[PDB]
Amino acid sequence: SSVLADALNAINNAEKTGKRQVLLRPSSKVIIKFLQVMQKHGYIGEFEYIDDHRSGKIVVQLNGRLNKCGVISPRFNVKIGDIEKWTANLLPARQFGYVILTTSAGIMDHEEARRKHVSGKILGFVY
Amino acid sequence: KGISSSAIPYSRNAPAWFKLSSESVIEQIVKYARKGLTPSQIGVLLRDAHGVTQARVITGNKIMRILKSNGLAPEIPEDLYYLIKKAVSVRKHLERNRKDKDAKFRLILIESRIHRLARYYRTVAVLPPNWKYE
């Protein structure tokens, strides 16, 4: 399967149930920098990457603020004059929420993407 | 299915109650190899003879590369040879008494599981190709 999609499904349905500390077994540095930028936006609390050599596990002490995360499995090129269309098609509002894209610095959201004036492909959305 | 496997620890060095040198383990494993024992049996007889964990920890590398370095390489790998030996044994039993339809089923399954690994070994090219199980 897709490790990023299964990780974000893990924290999504654990938040939907209503737990606090979620274990997340298959980790990678894409998921690390993903939920690093979402904790910069304060959508989870702190977390931890316990390092055993095989894959490393993730435990997130999320508080209450997520309602839906996720990815988009075709990671296609998206121009700067199209992230407004993608925000309008993915989120319930303009500034309510974010959508994070893979770009030439890499795990920026769309606010930081229009600030730095770069773009790339879409890997996930969070609101 | 079920899980039942080893749990190699977090440390990656000789466990410091070791009281034995490094090349002595190399001499021990080439001694067992010249006795004619398969690498997995070298590994278990080295877990139990003198207290090593495994050779990638205690020596500089794994037993396959250290036996290729000492010149006692196998011409076919362990799992390939063992599946071939199981296949010829169940073939001999079925030719002793052809009525064993469950042995016919298991021979078909072992033939499939050995042709999968033969496909892997040919596509990685570590045995010479044209090798297609006789």
Added chain:
RNA sequence: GCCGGUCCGAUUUUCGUGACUGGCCAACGGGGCCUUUCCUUCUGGUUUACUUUGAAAAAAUUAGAGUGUUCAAAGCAGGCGUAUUGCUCGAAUAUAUUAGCAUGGAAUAAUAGAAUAGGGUUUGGUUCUAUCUAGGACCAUGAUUAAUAGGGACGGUCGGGGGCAUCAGUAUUCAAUUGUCAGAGGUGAAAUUCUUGGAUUUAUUGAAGACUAACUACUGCGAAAGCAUUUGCCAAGGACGUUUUCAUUAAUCAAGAACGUAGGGAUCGGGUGGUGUUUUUUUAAUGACCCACUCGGCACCUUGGAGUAUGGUCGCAAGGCUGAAACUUAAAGGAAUUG
């Protein structure tokens, strides 16, 4: 920045300043050096998809712009001067890109990719120290982690899993030999059949094939259909155990092939720990029960039709005591009949 000192003046310590000196300490930056140790392997005699470009861009094309065609539909002014080197302005604004021309930077997703692993020959032959040594050549080797992805080894096991032999049981049938006498069978009743050449029943056997009563459960196994006597052989398989090995070998299915939402209790198989009874002790082996944990199982418990109506279209009970009509007509019937 710390400290010692040559001094001037006071002093026979110590201070003011001006010089000037070195011993050291941190922050800056500059030039090198070590992290390509000293020794073997090239094609033959890193690149690609994102952002900013300019260049040539088709009038018409986009949208825009000021102007009283009397407004609008439409059309498209620079005009004044100082009509003399200048004003006040507007056809300023905005696509030719899916395709190209080439340029310039990093994550993702691909394409590559390190010239590492010798301080490994049996021999052959050269000279050089006071029997010990030095320096020449041939002859047998390919990047980290080990997924609660995968296959493989190994171990005590595990099963009414399979194949082949083998052992058994009392049934069932048949046969033999005994025994005694009129019934035996069979059904709701019968009947058929068997029977004094002794049926049924009894006892002692013997043969034949098939099947594995009770144990049998919400238990075990196998890919599925299925699989229950014992013992042995032949292989196989599953779970567990594992500080053993390989290194992505994985999954999914046409064609083909073989066979036919969460929680809890209990149980089976394996392992760990506990510490009582079963056990027992110098023959080997390593049982049962309880409790906790853990892994895997077969399982369990609790959260458009319905009607109705039809002058239509199509079929039809339709239509009368039969016999019985051209014939008022018989026999025999059904009708209702206390004649």
